[PDB]
From Swiss-Prot:
Present with 8970 molecules/cell in log phase SD medium. It comes from Saccharomyces cerevisiae (strain ATCC 204508 / S288c). This is Protein transport protein DSL1. It is found in: Endoplasmic reticulum membrane. Component of a peripheral membrane protein complex consisting of DSL1, SEC39/DSL3 and TIP20. Bound to a SNARE complex consisting of UFE1, USE1, SEC20 and SEC22 or YKT6 through direct interaction of TIP20 with SEC20. Binds the coatomer complex through direct interaction with RET2/COPD and RET1/COPA. Binds TIP20 and SEC39/DSL3. Required for protein transport between the Golgi and the endoplasmic reticulum. May tether coatomer-coated retrograde transport vesicles to the ER membrane through interaction with coatomer as well as the SNARE complex. May contribute to the stabilization of the SNARE complex. Residues 25-183 are annotated as: Interaction with TIP20.
Length: 315
């Protein structure tokens, strides 16, 4: 319908141009002014089309910047502000839906594309071919601009233009609710955090990592098994996650890992230390060093893992 609105203004402008030339005096100077307003209005309307097109072709980053510029013009654009209450009402309603469709689209791409989370499994895929046209999207690039545009410094910015510039209160809430769920599930990985917490170091809860498909699998299932399951989580974080997400999960789970791994080993030292050399003891050693590498790779500073305490225990 933007195309139709562009067409109506073009026809008004053309009929006015003809009316003016038909005249050819202070009645001429106002029609020429009126014409320039319609010309500027045309340009304004083309920006709304730009937003829609960028959403359509999945230039999602550009769409945001297109919208940002539009909302500034809705504030200050002389041609726009010369339009009627009825006109602006219809514009606002439509632009509100564009805010909503944009963020709804990001949620879909995240929920139905990059991540596949079920009752018993977490799969991550770092690229997607999205929609009817199978547009290639890379996760790193995608989430870089998403975090930048919508969640700078990691939280929902409720006083930022993207929410604040929304016209109607109900649409604004819809945009806010969607962005909140995105922040929770995809900036903070809340479902992933809970799943890992609820299964690690629990007897009879098994965890495996399928590295080729990139799936962390939780299933119904001894000391080695608890360890191989915790190691699957470590492998998933080291080798399976994007940089951003390894950092976030290491920040959130690190202190739990340090305390829960150390106590498990201490409490099961006798079996672990039964032989001089064993696969069991080897596995404990490998996990201990994987925790060291996880702290380093994730670049967090809220926990450390020298490996020292456990390296000493195995001696």
């Amino acid at each position: 319908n933007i195309n139709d609105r562009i067409k109506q203004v073009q026809n008004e402008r053309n009929e006015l141009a003809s009316k003016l030339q038909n005249l050819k005096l202070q009645r001429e100077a106002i029609l020429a002014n009126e014409l320039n307003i319609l010309d500027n209005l045309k340009t304004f309307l083309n920006l709304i089309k730009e937003v829609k097109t960028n959403l359509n072709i999945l230039e999602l980053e550009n769409c945001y910047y297109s919208l940002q510029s539009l909302r500034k013009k809705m504030r200050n654009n002389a041609a726009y502000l010369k339009q009627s209450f009825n006109f602006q009402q219809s514009i606002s309603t439509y632009v509100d839906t564009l805010h909503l469709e944009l963020v709804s689209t990001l949620y879909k791409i995240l929920t139905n594309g990059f991540w596949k989370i079920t009752e018993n499994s977490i799969q991550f895929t770092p690229t997607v071919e999205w929609g009817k046209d199978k547009v290639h999207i890379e996760y790193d690039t995608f989430m870089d601009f998403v975090a930048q545009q919508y969640f700078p410094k990691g939280s929902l910015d409720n006083q930022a233009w993207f929410i604040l510039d929304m016209t109607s209160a109900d649409s604004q809430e819809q945009v806010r609710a969607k962005l909140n769920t995105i922040m929770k599930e995809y900036m903070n990985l809340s479902r992933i955090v809970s799943m890992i917490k609820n299964s690690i170091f629990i007897s009879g809860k098994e965890i495996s990592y399928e590295n080729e498909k990139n799936i962390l699998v939780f299933s119904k299932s001894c000391v080695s098994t608890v360890l191989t399951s915790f190691e699957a989580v470590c492998d998933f974080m080291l080798d399976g996650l994007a940089f951003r997400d390894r950092k976030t999960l290491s920040y959130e789970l690190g202190p739990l890992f340090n305390t829960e791994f150390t106590k498990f080993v201490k409490n099961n030292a006798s079996i672990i230390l039964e032989s001089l050399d064993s696969p069991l003891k080897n596995l404990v050693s490998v996990i201990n060093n994987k925790l060291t590498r996880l702290v380093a790779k994730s670049e967090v500073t809220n926990w450390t893992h020298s490996g020292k305490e456990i390296q000493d225990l195995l001696m």
